[PDB]
Design a binder for these strands. Structure first.
Ligand SMILES: Nc1nc2c(ncn2[C@H]2C[C@H](O)[C@@H](COP(=O)(O)OP(=O)(O)OP(=O)(O)O)O2)c(=O)[nH]1
Ligand SMILES: [Ca+2]
Ligand SMILES: [Ca+2]
Ligand SMILES: [Ca+2]
Length: 342
DNA sequence: GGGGGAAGGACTA
DNA sequence: CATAGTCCTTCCCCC
C-alpha cells in the first residue's frame, strides 16, 4: 500500500495572496477580530514571510502588530477559502477514488494502484503538485509512505512547497528516532503525560505494560501508539462525513444576564442553521466560554429533528441551565447541532 | 455483569 | 486568548 498526503502551504494566507497577488513577498497575517477592543482576537495563520518573525496562528493580534507593525492584516474570509479547497479537492479525485478529506487543507489519496512503487508515486506527487499550482495557483507539500500517519509525517518538512517519501526502512528509523511529540494525534497534554512515563520516543511504548497506557492516555490512544511502533499500523482511506455544525460568537463584553446574551446566541443559531443546509439535527448543544477561558456545554437529544423554532427555545433553556450551574461570567457563547439524519 | 444510550468534558489540530 | 471529532469516563435503565 502507498498513501499520498496533500497539505496546502499556509492555506488562508496563500489564498489571500492569490486573490491579490500584490500581497506576495510581504508579511501577511489572516486574523480573527472579535471586537472586544478594536484589535481583539488572534491570528488564524500567516504566510512564511511573517512566521519567520514569530507571528503565527494562536497569538493575539495586538502582540502581532508589536512585532510587525507593517504587515498586512486581513480579516479571515473562511467561505472564500472553503470554496478554493473544494475546487482543489474535486481535483484530487482524478488521481484516486480512494480519497479522504481530513481537513480544509489536508487530504489523503490512496494510490496503491495508479502506481507502481515510490519512484513512481513520487512522480505522481509531482504531477499533483504542478497540476494544483497551474489550475489553482496553490503550492502544497506532499507526503508518501506505507500509511497515513507516516504520509502525514513525511509532509512534515517538505513543507512548505515540498515533497518527501518515507521508505519502509526510514519508517523503522523514526519509530526509534522521531520525537513522540511530533506524531499525529499527540497534543501537549498527551505528549506530556508520556514524558512523565519515560516514553520519549515511539519504541518506548513497547517497553511498558498495556494496563498503564490504557490508564493514562486511554485504550484507543494506547493501541494506536503501539501498532504504529510495531509497524502494524494501518488504517484505510475512508471518506468522512460531517458529524456536527456550529458557530460560537464573542460578546462585546462579559455578561451573566440572560437578556444580554440572547442576541449573540440567536445569531449563532441563525448562522448555524444556514451552515446546516438541509441537514436535520436531532441533538442540540449550547457551548459557553467562561470569563477565565474555560468551556462549559449543555445539550439535549430529541427523538426527532429540531426545527428553527425548537432550537431557539431549547438553546434558551440549556443556557439558563448553564448560568445556573456555573457562577462565572460568560465571554463566548455558541451552539452545536449534531446527530443529523439523511 | 453487560449492553445501550446520553450527557459533559478532555484533547487535538 | 478565535470548529469538530474521537475518545472517554460516568451515570442511568433494564434484561
Ligand atoms: N481559524 C484558525 N485556523 C487555523 C488555525 N491554525 C491553523 N488554521 C488553518 C491554517 C490553514 O488555513 C489550515 C492548515 O493549518 P496548518 O496547521 O496545517 O498550517 P497552515 O496551513 O496554516 O500552513 P502550513 O501547513 O505551515 O504551510 O488551517 C487556528 O489557530 N485558527
Ligand atoms: Ca497546510
Ligand atoms: Ca492543517
Ligand atoms: Ca504535533
Amino acid at each position: 500500500m502507498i498513501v499520498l498526503f496533500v497539505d496546502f502551504d499556509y492555506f488562508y494566507a496563500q489564498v489571500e495572496e492569490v486573490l491579490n497577488p500584490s500581497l506576495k513577498g510581504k508579511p501577511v497575517v489572516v486574523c480573527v477580530f472579535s471586537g472586544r477592543f478594536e484589535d481583539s482576537g488572534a491570528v488564524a495563520t500567516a504566510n512564511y514571510e511573517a512566521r519567520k518573525f514569530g507571528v503565527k496562528a494562536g497569538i493575539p493580534i495586538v502582540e502581532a502588530k508589536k512585532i510587525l507593525p507593517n504587515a498586512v492584516y486581513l480579516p479571515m474570509r473562511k467561505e472564500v477559502y472553503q470554496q478554493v479547497s473544494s475546487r482543489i479537492m474535486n481535483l484530487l479525485r482524478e488521481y484516486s477514488e480512494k480519497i479522504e478529506i481530513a481537513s480544509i487543507d489536508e487530504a489523503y489519496l490512496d494510490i496503491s494502484d495508479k502506481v507502481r512503487d515510490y519512484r513512481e508515486a513520487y512522480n505522481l506527487g509531482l504531477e499533483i503538485k504542478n497540476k494544483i499550482l497551474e489550475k489553482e495557483k496553490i503550492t502544497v507539500t506532499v507526503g508518501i509512505s506505507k500509511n497515513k500517519v507516516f504520509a502525514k509525517i513525511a509532509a512534515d518538512m517538505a513543507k512548505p512547497n515540498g515533497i518527501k517519501v518515507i521508505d519502509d526502512e526510514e519508517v523503522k528509523r523514526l519509530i526509534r528516532e522521531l520525537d513522540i511529540a511530533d506524531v499525529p494525534g499527540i497534543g501537549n497534554i498527551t505528549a506530556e503525560k508520556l514524558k512523565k512515563l519515560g516514553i520519549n520516543k515511539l519504541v518506548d511504548t513497547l517497553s511498558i505494560e498495556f494496563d498503564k497506557l490504557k490508564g493514562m492516555i486511554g485504550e484507543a490512544k494506547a493501541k494506536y501508539l503501539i501498532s504504529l511502533a510495531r509497524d502494524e499500523y494501518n488504517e484505510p482511506i475512508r471518506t468522512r462525513v460531517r458529524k456536527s455544525i456550529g458557530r460560537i460568537v464573542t460578546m462585546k463584553r462579559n455578561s451573566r444576564n440572560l437578556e444580554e446574551i440572547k442576541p449573540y446566541l440567536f445569531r449563532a443559531i441563525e448562522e448555524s442553521y444556514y451552515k446546516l443546509d438541509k441537514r436535520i439535527p436531532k441533538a442540540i448543544h449550547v457551548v459557553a466560554v467562561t470569563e477565565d477561558l474555560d468551556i462549559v456545554s449543555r445539550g439535549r437529544t430529541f427523538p426527532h429533528g429540531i426545527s428553527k423554532e425548537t432550537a431557539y427555545s431549547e438553546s434558551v433553556k440549556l443556557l439558563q441551565k448553564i448560568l445556573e450551574e456555573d457562577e462565572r461570567k460568560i465571554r463566548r457563547i455558541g451552539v452545536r447541532f449534531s446527530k443529523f439524519i439523511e
